[PDB]
């Protein structure tokens with residue numbers, strides 16, 4: 001549970017937003033990329049895994065599941081690469097809802113940033129700090145700390 | 150001290166490596182940039198603060214302390230922007246040692262990556278996972294979790 005992440009790819013302004021969600025907490029990391037490639041996904045995973053203890057990643061689609069560069073990054077970082085098939089059907093809708101929520105935040109900050117990448121990081125900030133009462137940022141830290149102890 | 154970070158800028162292969170160190174744990178985040186500008190530093194801080202609870206940042210030099218874009222990012226993210234003057238003289242050497250250690254790791258992985266940015270993220274991974282016995286990654290999580298409770 002504490003090491004499980006899900007990849008998610010959404011689109012805005014003719015650009016691609018790559019998202020990793022910590023399943024147990026709802027905490028996210030995200031980046032804007034020109035297009036979703038194996039190489040971009042692999043690089044994003046290397047960054048993620050140096051920052052949080054990533055044990056398992058549910059990939060967002062079959063191309064990233066298949067990508068040799070993604071497989072190389074998962075091997076390098078000690079990550080079990082799995083599919084992201086929603087065997088639990090509620091999973092699709094939950095990801096859908098997050099994407100809409102993220103796009104909504106982006107719209108609310110879009111004025112304060114010249115570049116989309118900046119607005120996305122602002123949206124990450126707002127999402128992770130939002131009290132729902134703990135925040136996603138508080139939850140991920142508590143979950144991982146409990147796992148260590 | 151759970152919210153205190155220090156910025157650090159080092160050079161390699163004609164490029165700039167921008168580093169943020171969580172002072173209490175030794176945990177780091179880093180990025181390769183073309184050159185250290187206010188705008189790059191501001192963007193890096195927005196990313197950092199969406200991921201960890203950044204309360205205070207000791208800036209790496211006077212230009213980033215002065216930068217209006219850096220000041221804007223600190224205001225936006227709720228960060229107290231401070232100087233990084235080593236009133237404790239041991240601070241200079243500790244940062245020095247980390248930079249040398251980081252460059253050494255980069256050299257050990259440099260073969261496994263075509264691009265410096267990739268080697269830097271690999272070095273971040275190795276640094277944060279290294280058992281010294283807990284790792285920096287374990288320490289930052291424990292420090293922050295304890296602060297929340």
Ligand SMILES: CC(C)C[C@H](CNC(=O)c1ccc(N)cc1)Cc1ccc2c(c1C(=O)O)OCO2
Nearest residue numbers: 111112113114115118188189191192221222225
């Ligand atoms: C902290 C934030 C409130 C302001 C920063 C500076 N932006 C402006 O002054 C500005 C300019 C024109 C506008 N129509 C709106 C805002 C944002 C920022 C920081 C670092 C970056 C950026 C950006 C960005 O604007 O995308 O781009 C990559 O490096």
Ligand SMILES: CC(C)C[C@H](CNC(=O)c1ccc(N)cc1)Cc1ccc2c(c1C(=O)O)OCO2
Nearest residue numbers: 039040042043072073076260261262263264267
């Ligand atoms: C996971 C790692 C073991 C291998 C990845 C693929 N690299 C190679 O196959 C390769 C090619 C030529 C060499 N002389 C050495 C390694 C690294 C990687 C992943 C994502 C990226 C990258 C890189 C990068 O190589 O910098 O660049 C930006 O997006």
Ligand SMILES: [Cl-]
Nearest residue numbers: 051052053286
């Ligand atoms: Cl870690």
Ligand SMILES: [Cl-]
Nearest residue numbers: 137200201202
């Ligand atoms: Cl946070």
